[PDB]
Symmetry: D2
Subunit: 245 residues, 4 copies
């Protein structure tokens, strides 16, 4: 019944989300950067565990690339009911060392992406009277973080987008929500030297452990569900207690 | 497998929560005020739709009454894995007309209740390394509301409790979360003259409709689930967009 | 012109506030617990420093005690234009060890006090079309703290109260705001071993120092000023960057 | 002693800020868009009112434009101690109708500007151990607004930036804070038909009036003061009670 698009859906958190949405019964489409050569290996690996996906290349930072990609998906698969804006990078540098190139890379990939991917899907969801849009932020959007003037600006901006869009289209049966994960067990975090995990990262987390990508995926699946229609404009923290407010 | 206690579990939101938790597979125990004569009619109605509950009388405002009630439940049913602090009243009056009697009734029933019900269950959850505590607040805790200096103080206080407890026991596998519903279709809200619903209440809600108690129950069930262990110290808004922050 | 009441005004943060408001041109009245035998000492000290204050015994936990104190202040000094609810205590214990006595002491002194002290002064403020109420909270109300389910509940509750009352009387030229301080250099904190200050306290504060009570008092003075009339229902953090949201 | 830069300083809120900081004893420099031909008129007016300012053309959306402007200000006037990022625009359109041009105009002018203007002044502030950065947001960043997915994204983004930068430099005596105004009596708003003010704007504001630009400027002056050094990473609401959280 529902068709879901997950940007950056073939790796890390993206992948957990795509798998969970698939297992919830949705038809899942993922997007990947043109530079990523693994979409055929990934679709075969996924077919081997018995999950059928589609996959499209896009540059989420480029408006026309996104309009095109979404047109193809609607042609080939069908109308988008669910969108998870998960694509995003970091270019961590203190403000004193941060240059315009790396400011821009983060704002364009992480926040412009939200406009570029969301605009082409909304009119259909409004026209059918049902939609779910989930913007994947970060605890560092809420809290701030050293070396992340760019990343926290983009991720906090994403929730400003969430709120305004939510107000525009709530009455038509479309929800818009932000999810802000803390530290997860993914390739970037798990490569940290063990002593830094144990003496720097884990002490910041009351739960005393990393989050699993599958846990965050379960929350995204709840928000995309039929009975989550009264939750809109929210920012849901899934962070082990690392930050509360 | 899990045993859940829902205060005020036999009516309004309480009941939706108890039903949903039952249908999720939990063994559900409800509490009711000694003044409520309907526990036998309710348990029969519930048995008729095929749900097995237990029900205990308690005064959530009284510490010893709660310790006793929880002892009986542990004796008769077994150890408490899940607690939903849902009991709560309103005594709405502007501060200028509000007297100490009605200030107290709300603070004692709505906030002291959280201490009184939660304290006797925590040591077991910590000892087994698993627990879920869900505190049911209100959008008026976040936003404030005219005539609710007492109610918003109690409901905002509940989330202060949530945060501190969450920090104390996160490392032992126990989560503590607040849920803040907006306007729901329950007997108090549905009795409002139709014109007031249409010209005063609904215009405050971007979704353009009341929430269902079952919707809030679905969110509580998500928080009590096995895969919601990385969400703790949160306050999740389920309000149709009525308030965002 | 303005007459200000500062509960707990003879010591710690309350002192700094009383001093600052005096020096801003207000006539300052303080309250103290009837079992505090330091009033003559504090007045003598203040007089030798050139400041004139009135000091009245009150039990802020007791509604009639507060009502009678304010009536006396209105007879002997004049109508109250400014109230700063600064009185409050701690009784820190984890929930597993916290007894009802110590839950209650903190809820009644810290939260019931806002109702007890604020109710007898609001009508006047409203009738004259001008007033300032400032509720002194804590960073621990925003973030929670181990050992402070009682304190965080009371201090978060205070801000619930702030919001609801602000909505009730904003139209009449009365403002109500919360101030949430972090770690301050009061006698209590500056008596923490230097060692614990360096390894446990200061690392929580990006500013790398304790706040001065004078600095918090400058903020209260700002909120009590004639030009702060458009700030209402807010919770202003003054914590050296210890918590942000 | 202190040298202050106020972007957008010749009109509206920026004007009130520039005036207030001047009157607080600071040496105030303003910036304006190079296509604004009003600088001589504004200086003449200010001079006749007894205030002396310097005004420099800048494109806040352009990184090199801002870097060269600050270098000129440092040569002709002196090192910048205070920066108020007040410049910003609106291009209101619902997402369904919003084009990339108008997304971009607002992200670049409102959000990239904080990076462009703040980066060239931070090192100085850090080297001397004193600085104040104030980012002017909006109530619509906190709450979202119909037609403002772009504006809310930029203004919420600004506060993301505030938090991360505050964490980076708090240890060096530099503060970074956001101020979020509600409806203000600027030329634009006071030109809304009286009719729309009464039925559409004022009912959103518990205070029952528009804010004065002077009132917001008094808050900025407070944050820029010597005694506000322990306030950092905050977002202070000045909205007549329009939004609370
Ligand atoms: Cl005392
Ligand atoms: Cl300009």
């Amino acid at each position: 019944k529902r068709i879901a698009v997950v940007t950056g859906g073939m790796g890390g958190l993206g992948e957990a989300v795509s798998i969970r949405l698939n297992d919830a019964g949705h038809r899942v489409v993922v997007t990947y950067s043109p530079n990523n050569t693994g979409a055929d290996r990934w679709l075969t690996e996924m077919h081997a565990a018995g999950r059928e996906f589609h996959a499209y290349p896009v540059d989420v930072a480029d408006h026309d690339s996104c309009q095109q990609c979404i047109e193809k998906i609607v042609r080939d698969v069908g109308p988008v009911d669910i969108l998870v804006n998960n694509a995003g990078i970091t270019r961590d540098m203190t403000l004193r060392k941060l240059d315009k190139v790396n400011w821009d890379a983060v704002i364009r990939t992480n926040l412009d992406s939200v406009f570029n991917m969301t605009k082409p899907v909304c009119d259909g969801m409004v026209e059918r009277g049902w939609g779910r849009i989930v913007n994947i932020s970060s605890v560092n959007g809420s809290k701030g973080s050293v070396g992340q003037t760019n990343y926290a600006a983009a991720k906090a901006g994403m929730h400003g987008f969430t709120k305004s869009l939510a107000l525009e289209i709530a009455r038509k049966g479309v929800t818009v929500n932000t999810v802000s994960p803390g530290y997860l067990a993914t390739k970037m975090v798990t490569a940290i030297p063990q002593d830094i995990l144990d003496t720097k990262i884990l002490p910041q987390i009351p739960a005393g452990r990393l989050g699993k990508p599958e846990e965050v995926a379960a929350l995204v699946a709840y928000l995309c569900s039929e009975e989550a229609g009264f939750v809109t404009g929210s920012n849901i923290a899934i962070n082990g207690g690392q930050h509360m407010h």
